[PDB]
């Protein structure tokens, strides 16, 4: 067979972590800094 119980379950838990990581990293990448400061 292509997959075992072990491999398959491992894939499922990996995906949950990838989904959370992807969300977290996505929000981290979408972070900007200021072009200029308001005043002295």
């Amino acid at each position: 067979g292509f997959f075992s119980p072990g491999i398959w379950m491992g894939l499922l838990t990996t995906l949950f972590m990838l989904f959370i990581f992807t969300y977290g990293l996505h929000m981290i990448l979408s972070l900007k800094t200021m072009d200029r400061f308001d005043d002295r």
């Binding site: 067979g1 119980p5 398959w8 379950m9 499922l12 838990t13 949950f16």
Partner: protein, 203 residues
């Protein structure tokens, strides 16, 4: 849209491959090699249960937290000209905390049911354990997502309430009614999650 394009391309390729593989298994008349029962039965009920528990708590926090930032920014911003806002409109964040609580209580009641099996061959073993396992997953998922979207709703509404109240203090009380409906949405998810695990057993 560079990231959205990446996400879509993966999404399409993911399912496109499943379509080709699935139809091929049919076309080449494979002996039920793609066995869903096998996938569901070999996967330990412990995995399903603990996933639902983590989701129930984690998704509910995501919702609450989502709403927290929605109304937090609106409240803080508006307050620059209307400092009165903090007197009443902070209740929206109390609503979000209540949304988070929903998931916490449910998650604990579910986790309290977790037991060892000392089981091996699923054949005629743990028949009830599989039912209870899947149920725990579902109930956890049910309440988690329900609280997730509840928290977002109440956040969006609370923002509008703060923006309205900033300009007219008479509007807050009437508008608050909408946030109460939002909270009910989360509670409904709780009711079902309770029912789904109301009659489960381990061992």
């Amino acid at each position: 849209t560079g990231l959205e394009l990446l996400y879509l391309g993966i999404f399409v390729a993911f399912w496109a491959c499943m379509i080709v593989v699935g139809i091929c298994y049919t076309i080449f008349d494979l002996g039920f090699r793609f066995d869903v029962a096998w996938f569901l039965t070999e996967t330990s009920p412990f995995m399903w249960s603990n996933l639902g528990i983590g989701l129930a708590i984690s998704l509910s926090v995501v919702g609450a937290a989502w709403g927290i930032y929605i109304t937090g920014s609106s409240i803080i911003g508006g307050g620059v000209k209307a400092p009165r806002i903090k007197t009443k409109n902070l209740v929206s964040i109390i609503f979000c905390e209540a949304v988070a609580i929903y998931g916490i209580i449910m998650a604990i009641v579910i986790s309290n049911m977790a037991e060892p099996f000392s089981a091996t061959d699923p054949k005629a073993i743990g028949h009830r354990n599989y039912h209870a396992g899947y149920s725990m997953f579902g109930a956890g998922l049910t309440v988690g997502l329900s609280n997730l979207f509840c928290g977002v709703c109440v956040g969006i509404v609370g923002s509008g309430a703060a923006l309205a109240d900033a300009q007219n203090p008479s509007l807050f009380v009437k508008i608050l009614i909408v946030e109460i409906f939002g909270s009910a949405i989360g509670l409904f998810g709780v009711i079902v999650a309770i029912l789904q695990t109301s009659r489960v057993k381990m061992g």
